[PDB]
Swiss-Prot record:
It is found in: Cytoplasm; Cytoplasm, Perinuclear region. Residues 8-138 form the YTH domain. The gene is YTHDC2. RNA binds at K14, S15, S16, W30, W80. It comes from Homo sapiens. Transmembrane segments: none annotated. It comes from the Eukaryota. The chain holds residues 1288 to 1421 of 1430 of the full protein. Expressed in testis. Not detected in spermatogonia next to the tubule wall but is strongly expressed in spermatocytes, suggesting that it is up-regulated in germ cells upon entry into meiosis. This is 3'-5' RNA helicase YTHDC2. Belongs to the DEAD box helicase family. DEAH subfamily.
Length: 141
């Protein structure tokens, strides 16, 4: 028969504050730790798309998600909250609505002690099985 070899991945990106995220909404870019960039880069090259679910540590909701549009490096920006950065990349914003955890309260991640999706550190790989059904949620809003 047939089988899907290539596919988009899902990475959870946490944000200290909200403002910092605004830059990604206006400038259309995002800068993450150089310890979780590789994946985003490689994956983007080994995958058709790269879904990155952004979330603010504070707010108990999902700031949303954006599919990587450009690789990390060549792209550079200035405006930012945390100077401690190295490697900026673009990102396509799909949903900007705040989704209540309650919605993704049933969804979990069997990749890390089957811990609730939300329960993911910055730059953490999210299973494509739970990361896909987690986005569609924004469609139920």
């Amino acid at each position: 028969g047939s089988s899907g070899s290539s596919g988009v991945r899902y990475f959870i990106m946490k944000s200290s504050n909200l403002r910092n995220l605004e830059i990604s909404q206006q400038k259309g870019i995002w800068s993450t730790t150089p310890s979780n960039e590789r994946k985003l880069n490689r994956a983007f090259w080994e995958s058709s798309i790269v879904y990155l679910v952004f979330s603010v540590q504070g707010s108990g909701h999902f700031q949303g998600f954006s599919r990587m549009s450009s690789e990390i490096g060549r792209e550079k920006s200035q405006d930012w909250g945390s100077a401690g950065l190295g490697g900026v990349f673009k990102v396509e914003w799909i949903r900007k609505e705040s989704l209540p955890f309650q919605f993704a309260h049933h969804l979990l991640n069997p990749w890390n002690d089957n811990k609730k999706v939300q329960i993911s550190r910055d730059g953490q790989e999210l299973e494509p099985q739970v990361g896909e059904q987690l986005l569609q949620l924004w469609e139920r809003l």
